[PDB]
Amino acid sequence: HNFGAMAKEVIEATAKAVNNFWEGLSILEISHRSKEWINVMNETKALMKEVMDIPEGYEILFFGGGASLQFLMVAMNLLNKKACYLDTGVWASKAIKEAENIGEVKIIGTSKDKNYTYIPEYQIPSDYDYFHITTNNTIYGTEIRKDIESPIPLVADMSSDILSKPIDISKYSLIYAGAQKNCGAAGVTIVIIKKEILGKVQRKIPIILDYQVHILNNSMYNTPPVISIFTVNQTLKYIKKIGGLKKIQELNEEKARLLYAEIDRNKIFRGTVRKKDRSIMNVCFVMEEQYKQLENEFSEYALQKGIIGIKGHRSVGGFRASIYNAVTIESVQALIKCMHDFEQLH
Amino acid sequence: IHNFGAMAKEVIEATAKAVNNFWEGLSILEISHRSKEWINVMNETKALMKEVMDIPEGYEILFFGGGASLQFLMVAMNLLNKKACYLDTGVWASKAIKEAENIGEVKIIGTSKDKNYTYIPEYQIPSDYDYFHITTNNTIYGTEIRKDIESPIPLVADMSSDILSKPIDISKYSLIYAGAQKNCGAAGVTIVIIKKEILGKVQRKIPIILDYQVHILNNSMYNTPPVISIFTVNQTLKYIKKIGGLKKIQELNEEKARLLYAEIDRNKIFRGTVRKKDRSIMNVCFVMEEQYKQLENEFSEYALQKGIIGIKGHRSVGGFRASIYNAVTIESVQALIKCMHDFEQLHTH
Lengths: 346, 349
Ligand SMILES: Cc1ncc(COP(=O)(O)O)c(C=O)c1O
Ligand SMILES: Cc1ncc(COP(=O)(O)O)c(C=O)c1O
Ligand SMILES: [Cl-]
Ligand SMILES: [Cl-]
Prior knowledge:
Chain A: It comes from Entamoeba histolytica HM-3:IMSS. By secondary structure, chain A is an alpha/beta fold. Chain A contains 9 helices and 12 strands.
């Protein structure tokens, strides 16, 4: 019924563009070498600059594949001697592992000890090539709050929180996001990168994995993921129309605030995650121990009521409500009402 | 208007429909790739490709984001242990070779670089290399390979510009791949068809995201796949089946090329760049005769005024290139021919 929604303006625009993008030609059949497309590339780049307040010295790239390709690219392009990572979840852990296959990694802090229910403390050593974080840990519902000011280059996987709120881009040397959550449709990954960090690795880098080759060719070194890039272009237009990332944040903060209040009020349920590290985007909650056996009964009940895709990833069990930008206040209230009624029957 | 670029209309409409409402009011852009609705598409696309292409048992089908260039690297990382060999028949072939050389030892066993890749060289395949890589249709130069290739070592092939233009004997190949923006689908997806028993034989470490095994173990959803581009491949396969398979698709293409080459050869304004026996049926390259060399630009503008678009050659050849993908109609080819025939800069009657 409702739970991975994309804004409707963006769906309609995309469909329109499939029927007729330019002069009768479908967006699926135009050349990516044509000027019509190059213009979209550049406007999308200018839109992301505007909407996110990207300063000078940062390049914007679009890659096919996902955040996982970037786990590798980050390491191959910046890990010369050694790099450090914060282990806050499945995605953080998968980044760390890919990087370890390339060279030396120090894990400077982890919350693996308590099923990643919290964000650990850490001291950033000043002699590593870069420091990599995962800002929203999608599976465990933790996010990072502290304004991070790294003495070395700061790399961040924002797959699950890019375009949910404004950020200070200048604090980061490289930001990336698989784009299927907020931000766009499956098939594209965004990379925003402070060019001056490249060129400092003695290892050879394959051409297709070399950020410089991509920068020099404005992300069309080879065929880019046109339609997914288009959906990013529209999503940026909609965020601007509706008054920017300040506003997007307020609506999200609210949606999360209601849902966490319901979780905490309701005796059937409890949030898994420490209050202070609670993510605004992925809201994880399990059955109270007393009602543990009702877990499956409630899934079926939510499904009967038209709520879909709130099952947690396996490792945590319980539930996870992913409150992406395009999920409405109304879809959140119907969850709350489903949870409330579940409590009142028991 | 006549369109060198066209996608079949059934496929465009189906994709648009699926963007509005794929399943129970939800757009294909908003469903979960972890949902059963999507998994079913993944599998039906796989079963369709198996059916339509007659893929034997022991071959896996994978879908990758990115393009054929990512596969240049994956191929080498997954199969080049000691050394491999390549045939140099063009820009794409040369780019594959280069990426592979950055990984390990490559013997280039034949090249047509000597004559601006106007022909397909002879070669002897050495039996002690890990694999032999070819580019079956050389998109920029308009050559394709004809000989039925029977390799004594694993045969890898970049079919980006000819996949789904005709039936092939899949059993001859150990790995086939295709960036999919030319016949078979829309930009954002690359197909890989792979004989699984060739994997596992490399001493080098392979990054997880580049390891074909990890992908196969997860049915191409090790991570988020390119959903919409995969859907367009799913529809393209349905259309090919409806209209009677790859045998039919071939006849129509062979015809379209046959007409256009006859016109190129008949017309004194123009000449085909490529040796006759190696002529590609997909990418038709032709330049101005030397006598009419200065008319090159005048003719581009003339074609454009007449509604023909995107026939300009890649820089390295100049001249022209008519890409006669499956979805380009006989009628669009005739209007090119009629445009060419209106060479009254000569006064032929
Ligand atoms: C924070 C985070 N990082 C990385 C990924 C992996 O994304 P992809 O499927 O684009 O490789 C995801 C996917 O959900 C995610 O939420
Ligand atoms: C034969 C061949 N190989 C490789 C490529 C590169 O594919 P991609 O742009 O999908 O990297 C192309 C692009 O046309 C091609 O025609
Ligand atoms: Cl996670
Ligand atoms: Cl070529």
